Design a protein around this nucleic acid. Structure first.
Lengths: 144, 149, 129
RNA sequence: AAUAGAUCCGUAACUUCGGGAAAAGGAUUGGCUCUGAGGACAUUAAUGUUAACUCAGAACUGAAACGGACAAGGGGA
RNA sequence: AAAAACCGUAAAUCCUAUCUUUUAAAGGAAGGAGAAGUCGUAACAAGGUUUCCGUAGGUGAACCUGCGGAAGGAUCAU
RNA sequence: CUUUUGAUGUUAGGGUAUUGGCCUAACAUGGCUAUGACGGGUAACGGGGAAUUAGAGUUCGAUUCCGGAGAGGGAGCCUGAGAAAUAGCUACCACAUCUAAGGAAGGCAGCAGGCGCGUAAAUUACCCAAUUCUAAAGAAGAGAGGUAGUGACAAGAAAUAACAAUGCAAGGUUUGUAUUGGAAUGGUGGGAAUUUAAAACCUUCCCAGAGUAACAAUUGGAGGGCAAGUCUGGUGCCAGCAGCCGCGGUAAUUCCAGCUCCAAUAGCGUAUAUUAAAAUUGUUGCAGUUAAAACGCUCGUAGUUGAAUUUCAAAGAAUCAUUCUUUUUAAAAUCCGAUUUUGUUACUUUGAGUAAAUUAGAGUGUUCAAAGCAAACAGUUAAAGCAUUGUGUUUGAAUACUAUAGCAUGGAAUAACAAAAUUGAACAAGCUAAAAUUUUUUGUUCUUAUUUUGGCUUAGUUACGAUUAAUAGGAGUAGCUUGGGGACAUUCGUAUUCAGAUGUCAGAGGUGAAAUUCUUAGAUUUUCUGGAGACGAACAACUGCGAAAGCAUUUGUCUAAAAUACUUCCAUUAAUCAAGAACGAAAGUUAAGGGAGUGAAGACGAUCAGAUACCGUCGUAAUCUUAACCAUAAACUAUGCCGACUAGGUGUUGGAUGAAGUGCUUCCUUCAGUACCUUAUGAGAAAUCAAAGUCUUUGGGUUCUGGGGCGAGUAUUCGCGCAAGCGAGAAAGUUAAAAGAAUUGACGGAAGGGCACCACCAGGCGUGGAGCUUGCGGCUUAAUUU
């Protein structure tokens, strides 16, 4: 045998078995469990606007040694508190204590990225001014 | 094997010759008469064929007369209402139930009784799927003791 | 429980051929396996086989030419329309220059090529190459 | 002081599965005029004689009132 | 024509009950992560009492002990 | 679950445009459901379709078309052919406008537009010219619709040069390459033709109009994956980079910069989601001994799957040597030696209906292409065709798909179902009951009967009528068959222990030492007697039996099983199985009894730094029996069950067969168990495996289970339980490994060997004991340089 029914009239068992077993892998469970809307702060959105609460340095993992400059954001959709990493070298001091900031995922969906522990989001622009256009080169205007 | 293990291929294989053996000058009429008399004296068809082969020297009654022994037994109208195998299974179940009643600590006998009654139910389902056993026949375990008629 | 006699016959033939024993005994003969064998024979994959008839659904002894490299059954017997014959043969057969996929069709047992040539694909039986 | 009879409905936590329980909490109730159901007894499948109060339903009716007096649990955490 | 009554369609409000979702909380008890913290040495070697299972009791902790199992053993073996 | 309150049906009615529990009355108790009813969720309008696709598949579809629904939420209603209409009305709820305060008026999910919400989306523009609708129907309207505006949503085409000479490099006078220096051309500005409802855009024409053609291309990278620098400065575990592995502590190929290079290119990154990758959801097509994963075991219903057997065959024309086409050959009804149908379904073949858009696809130079459905041809202005002089001609807008279900249809194979015997037929003859025909009593009218045929009963005649008996299954029968299978009763043995007695006298137990403990009242020891509970050694095995757990004293009874033998019977009765059921070690629970030995707890004595442990003395529960629970074990061969096939040898258990050492025993063959060894051009990652093989040459049947690790067998709910707990069983968060097998090394309070006075043994001389010199540490060191 093979461990599975092979009858010409055994489609019901195969379909039921596949339907039940599909709940085993992480991907399908993650993408078909309604809990994700309740869990993730973005409610399935790719980006989110929020209000900066305060800046905070976060330790890197043990093999590394760095003080990553992140910020704590109160989202406008739900008022949820999240921590977002501020990319760039000197961009931390270029954001204010109560400025509005647009934030996106960190590139691994709900997973931490790199040596940064527990940070799943990165800011992309502050005071509707892009951090890339504000740090990589001042080709855009400075902070308003 | 239905229960347990072991293939146990022991059986009896009929000879290639399908006709009556040439030496046999016996006549089918007296063969059937003897089979009727022996069944009347009272024996199940299996042992009827057994004593027919052993004492009358007429192997494979189907060769001597062109049909089977239970078939002629029915055609005479004297065949029993419960088939051989079902009757023997019922008898064995009745005996082991009677033993269990006295010795209820015999878990092994309980297990074997369960197996025997499973066989009884399967066999009776088949026999009543055929028309040769009444549709309401059930074999409840209470009156089986006297069910042997 | 033997279920499919044809599956057992083809498995036994395949094993005997891999052993290269030049002669193989197939116990539970049937008309279906006989037709399958003589189709194999007509396509030249086996020699002259001979069925021995007891009164017990007799046996078959087939002469092997060491020339078939895989014969097998397909279970369950899927019903194949004429359209997807080409869909199934490129999945089963090693190549479309040789090899045969055996069908049972309203006009008898035949391979995919002549099933095409006379239309009316049917249920799938097996293959050999 | 608050209902409290009866009928119909509905009844939680907990539980030793027996209860809790009349839990809690709703509706109805008179009079009158009717309708339906529930038995017994003799004659040649059918016709007559005759009894009990008990339920159910419908109209109408009244200063919306009817367990009209009497009698008659307050519940819950 | 107003107006009224009665069946019917029936919005809406309130009471009660149940269900669903979200959420506060003294206290309790977990898990994960961090740091060079304290205490011991449980496992890996026969890990220094072979290890492990189920069950039961005990102890600061790893853990210990009883009963019955397994070798994934440290024995394929007079 | 539904069913008082219509649930299912009947009867009657009412109501409707019509049928209908649609509603009413009476009556009945029905209707749906593990093939998932009834509920719950959906960030669910359905479909035509979209993305991705080798084939399967997976995901999406608010959104051009079709169908549905709604107009803030409900309900009600008028007109009307058509509305439960909402730019119609009425009321309530929520909003909200004007008011002289009395009262009025509202519904952008129509087009614009505004606020709000947000990551997230355009002009309060023009016109009815095209498409089409309404009307009293050329002529009026239409935010339908069309046009333009905003528009890097997507999609297509396509600039940022090209060329000649020297100089340079390469080559036998050929390529690439810094100077010159003239051509070409758009972008752009202007005018126009044209287009258009008007305008704009496109196209076309004419003026201007490129050398640093300043008319300048960017985005992201340069350690690997992955194309491209160990170039130069800055920083120096900081800043930072980095999807992952990682880089960063003075040479940073990785950060920050410059140069250079790479990739894509008017586009290039980022985030989220989705598809392929993913054979990591596996029907095709996964894995389950050890990596995650075979239920403890068996029975068992639903489901899935199921031995063989009924008409085989023969003969003829045509391409290449074959291949391909045609005819008949049993039986019953149809046609005067001939005329013609002979289960059902699945399945398969053909058709019919297949809306378009989309898709595939035929044709067609939109300058190409995306497109679109058009178009093409002669014609400085006329031949020809046809019409009895004028009238252009030729066309294309195909075809396929449109479930799986439904309609029709050819069908031989494969599958099912039907019919088929303690009987069931058919035919012939006679008998009986109706029909057809004919004759016909008889005054707008009454008989009747005759002959043939469809049906009943009764003698006889048919080839009268039943497939094997599966190395499937079940039943049976036989053996001075087998077995530690089970239950009950019964018997024995020794040890231990208790009590009594017995003799003797200093110890006895125990440990690596010891101690706790017993002991002049006589311990330990010797011998005897009686009792008690337990257990059943040695025999005893890579042996037996059992579904597993498990089962070893004798005998008896009861009970079952298996194998073997069978020319015994039945004839598919079978395999595996969610639910469900029986059994289920030990421990544990309940209640009686038992209670020697051992002994979780506990108490001591030791060891140790500590020792609540290992060791020792004692010891409660338990262990045992009975009656109930519990339902779990590394319940393990970590390997589900049934079936087929594939190889030698050594055994061994139980039968059967044949022959021969001596009525007795061995050998041969064989069945069924049960192990082991070798072998694999078998498998596997390997260890290893005769199954874990016959698997990318993938399909015998079937059940269960698994999908990175931790969280976690946790939380919560339900069922079960006296309880302990058992069964079912998440999520958040966190994390780049965890895991399997094997190799080398290293290590081991692992085993076995070997060597050495930096080891020992025969030994001797010494140091450390004293005083002193000297080095180091340390002690306050402008410094006691290090």
């Amino acid at each position: 045998g093979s461990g599975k029914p092979s009858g010409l009239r055994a489609a019901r068992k195969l379909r039921i078995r596949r339907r039940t077993q599909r709940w085993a892998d992480k991907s399908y469970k993650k993408s078909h469990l309604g809990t994700r809307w309740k869990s993730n702060p973005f409610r399935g959105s790719s980006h989110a606007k929020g209000i900066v609460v305060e800046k905070v340095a976060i330790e890197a993992k043990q093999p590394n040694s760095a003080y990553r400059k992140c910020v704590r954001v109160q989202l406008i959709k739900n008022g949820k508190k999240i921590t977002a990493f501020v990319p760039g070298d000197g961009c931390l001091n270029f954001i204010d204590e109560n400025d509005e900031v647009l934030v996106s995922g960190f590139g691994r969906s709900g997973h931490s990225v790199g040596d940064l522990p527990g940070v799943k989001f990165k800011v992309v622009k502050v005071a509707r001014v892009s951090l890339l256009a504000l740090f990589k080169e001042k080709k855009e205007k400075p902070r308003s | 094997r239905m229960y347990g293990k072991g293939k146990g291929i022991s059986s009896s294989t009929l000879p290639y010759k399908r006709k009556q053996p040439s030496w046999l000058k016996q006549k089918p009429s007296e063969i059937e008469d003897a089979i009727i008399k022996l069944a009347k004296k009272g024996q199940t068809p299996s042992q009827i064929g057994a004593t027919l082969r052993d004492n009358y020297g007429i192997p494979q009654v189907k060769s001597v007369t062109g049909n089977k022994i239970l078939r002629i037994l029915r055609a005479q109208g004297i065949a029993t209402t419960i088939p051989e195998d079902l009757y023997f299974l019922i008898k064995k179940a009745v005996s082991m139930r009677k033993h269990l009643e006295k010795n209820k600590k015999d878990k092994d006998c309980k297990f074997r009784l369960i197996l025997t009654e499973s066989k009884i139910h399967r066999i009776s389902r088949y026999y009543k799927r055929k028309k040769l056993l009444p549709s309401n026949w059930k074999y409840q375990s209470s009156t089986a003791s006297a069910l042997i008629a | 429980v033997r279920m499919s006699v044809l599956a057992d016959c083809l498995k036994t033939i395949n094993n005997a051929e891999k052993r290269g024993r030049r002669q193989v005994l197939i116990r539970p003969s049937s008309k279906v396996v006989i037709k399958f064998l003589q189709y194999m024979q007509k396509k030249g994959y086996i020699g002259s086989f001979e069925i021995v008839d007891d009164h017990r659904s007799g046996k078959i002894v087939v002469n092997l030419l060491g020339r078939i490299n895989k014969c097998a059954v397909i279970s369950p017997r899927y019903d194949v329309k004429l359209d997807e014959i080409e869909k199934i043969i490129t999945s089963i057969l090693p190549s479309r220059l040789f090899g045969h996929l055996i069908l049972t069709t309203p006009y008898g047992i035949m391979d995919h090529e002549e099933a095409r040539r006379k239309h009316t694909g049917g249920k799938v039986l097996g293959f050999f190459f």
